[PDB]
């Protein structure tokens, strides 16, 4: 009887029913051996009458909307080798009677609403190979001891459940298990040493639990081990040396634990290691040279630890390295030039160490490097002209070092450079006009250097969003061409030698949220134009200049300004123009020539009386 989706046995009776990938709605022949109604958008319960098809072997109801319990009558089917209930709405416990399906091989409960514990009955399934119950948030309790009795298990996953407690020593009886995935769950206590008895173990994923204790040494006796994800747990103690004995290990992630001791030299023997993540631990010692013998390493993340010593030059041997993160350690010495022999490097972050010496020119020869982060070290010397060679550089942070000399003009050669932070160094001379050539540049932070000379509109790319030149020796006048950067969100020129009027052209920066002109030699009158920039929101700081005249009436139009500091100027007249700004939070008018009365309002009442005392005539008055 074949239309489609229906199959018959030889004797002429209906055998298999299959329907999937249709669109439907609604709730859902005693010789039928196989039943697949899957991806049908079906709703309702699973009818207990299902348990009546005695010859059932496969039942796949997966990828539907079914609700209610898993009927215990389903477990009357003693011939079932596959039960797929996954990706539905099912709730309730896994019934104890699960243990009665004596031939069950595949069991898929994952991605449901199931709750309760895992019955101690699973241990009676001797043919069980795959059990995946993960993605049930309220599946809870300890993994039952009886799990050790499923002798044929290959795949076990309980991920994203509420499973708690320590994994039972029982686990060591599973001599065929390949993948154990119980991650983003409630587990605590130590990984049991008995796990070293699981000879076929390939992938161990325990990440995002509370597991405590240390990493059992026995894990090094697992010869087929490939991926170990133990990240974000309470793990304590030293990394087992014995891990160097796992020839197939390509991924190790111990990130976010309490580990101490040293990175083991034995790792040098792992010829298949692609990825080593030790990030956020207590690891001390030096990077061992033997690590440079792992030729397939793409990812080395050792950041946020106690590692001391020098970065080894033999790092040139890792020719596949894409990512090198050593930031937040005790590293000293020069950055080795031989690191540039790793031609594939995408990202180098060495920040927050003691690195000294010059930045090696050769590192800028990397044609694939997007991210170079050297911030917070002892680095000195020039920024090499070869910086123009690093074609794909996107994010550059050299800030918090001793770097000297001028910003090399060939930086104008970099067309993808988005973000550049050179602040807090000894840089001198002018900002090079050629930087107008970085057409992608949105963030430029030069603050706290010896930068000098004048400042031009032609000197800067019009794609700029963030500008911080504060704390330098910059001089002459803020150029009218500043009005050319219409993307500028934030402009900080504070603490310089700048002078002249504020050019009215400032009115055309339509995106400007924050403007800091503080601590300069600016003079004359605050132009009316400054009030014409509705976007001014975060801050406007005109303080510690020579401004005179009165607060422009247009200032009543900055309806979004949260912070305003005009203090330490020669400003006169009264504050009446300010009285209706409802979003004004902080106001500093002190050390000016202001005079006149301010209304008695919680706003003006919060102004410190010493602030009024440093002016000419200011006082709070009471209305009649």
């Amino acid at each position: 009887c074949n239309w489609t989706g229906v199959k018959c046995n030889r004797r002429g009776e209906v055998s298999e029913i299959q329907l999937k990938e249709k669109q439907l709605q609604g709730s859902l022949l005693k010789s039928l051996t196989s039943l697949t109604l899957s991806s049908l958008q079906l709703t309702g319960v699973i009818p207990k009458e299902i348990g009546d098809f005695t010859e059932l072997e496969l039942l796949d109801l997966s990828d539907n909307s079914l609700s209610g319990d898993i009927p215990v009558e389903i477990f009357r089917l003693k011939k079932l080798k596959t039960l797929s209930l996954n990706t539905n709405n099912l709730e309730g416990h896994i019934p104890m009677e699960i243990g009665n399906l004596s031939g069950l091989v595949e069991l898929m409960l994952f991605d449901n609403k199931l709750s309760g514990e895992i019955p101690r009955s699973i241990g009676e399934l001797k043919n069980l190979q795959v059990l995946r119950a993960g993605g049930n948030k309220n599946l809870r309790g300890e993994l039952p001891w009886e799990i050790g009795n499923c002798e044929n298990l290959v795949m076990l996953g309980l991920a994203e459940t509420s499973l708690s407690g320590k994994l039972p020593a029982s686990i060591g009886n599973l001599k065929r298990v390949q993948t154990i995935a119980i991650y983003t769950s409630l587990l605590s206590g130590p990984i049991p040493d008995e796990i070293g008895y699981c000879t076929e173990l390939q992938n161990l994923y325990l990440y995002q639990n509370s597991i405590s204790g240390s990493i059992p040494t026995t894990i090094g006796g697992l010869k087929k081990l490939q991926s170990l994800l133990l990240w974000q747990n309470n793990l304590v103690g030293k990394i087992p040396t014995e891990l160097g004995n796992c020839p197939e290990l390509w991924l190790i992630d111990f990130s976010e634990n309490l580990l101490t001791g040293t990175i083991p030299r034995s790792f040098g023997k792992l010829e298949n290691l692609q990825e080593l993540q030790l990030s956020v631990n207590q690891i001390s010692g030096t990077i061992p040279e033997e690590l440079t013998n792992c030729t397939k390493l793409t990812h080395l993340e050792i950041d946020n630890n106690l590692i001391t010593g020098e970065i080894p030059s033999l790092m040139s041997n890792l020719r596949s390295l894409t990512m090198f993160f050593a930031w937040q350690n005790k590293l000293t010495g020069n950055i080795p030039q031989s690191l540039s022999q790793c031609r594939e490097l995408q990202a180098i972050d060495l920040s927050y160490n003691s690195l000294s010496g010059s930045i090696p020119k050769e590192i800028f020869g990397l044609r694939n490097l997007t991210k170079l982060l050297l911030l917070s070290n002892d680095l000195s010397g020039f920024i090499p002209p070869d910086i123009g060679n690093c074609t794909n550089l996107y994010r550059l942070r050299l800030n918090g070092n001793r770097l000297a000399g001028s910003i090399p003009s060939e930086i104008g050669n970099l067309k993808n450079l988005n973000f550049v932070d050179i602040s807090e160094n000894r840089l001198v001379g002018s900002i090079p006009p050629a930087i107008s050539g970085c057409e992608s540049l949105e963030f430029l932070d030069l603050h706290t250097n010896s930068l000098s000379g004048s400042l031009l509109g032609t000197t800067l790319p019009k794609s700029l969003k963030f500008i911080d030149f504060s704390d330098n020796a910059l001089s002459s006048t803020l150029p009218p061409g500043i009005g050319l950067l219409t993307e500028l969100t934030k402009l900080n020129l504070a603490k310089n030698r700048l002078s002249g009027e504020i050019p009215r052209e400032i009115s055309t920066c339509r995106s400007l949220q924050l403007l800091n002109l503080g601590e300069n030699d600016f003079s004359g009158e605050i132009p009316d134009e400054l009030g014409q920039i509705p976007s001014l929101a975060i801050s406007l700081n005109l303080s510690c200049n020579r401004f005179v005249g009165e607060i422009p009436s247009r200032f009543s139009d900055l309806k979004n300004l949260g912070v305003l500091d005009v203090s330490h100027n020669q400003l006169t007249g009264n504050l009446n123009v300010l009285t209706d700004l409802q979003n004004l939070v902080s106001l500093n008018i002190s050390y000016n020539d202001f005079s006149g009365d301010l209304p008695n309002t919680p706003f003006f009442r919060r102004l410190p009386l010493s602030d009024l005392a440093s002016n000419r005539g200011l006082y709070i008055s009471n209305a009649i």
């Binding site: 994952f110 994203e160 994923y205 994800l229 990240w231 974000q232 982060l373 942070r397």
Partner: peptide
Amino acid sequence: DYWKPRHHPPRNN
């Protein structure tokens, strides 16, 4: 749908 296995997200500065 529960997430597939993954490593610790790298974090740079």
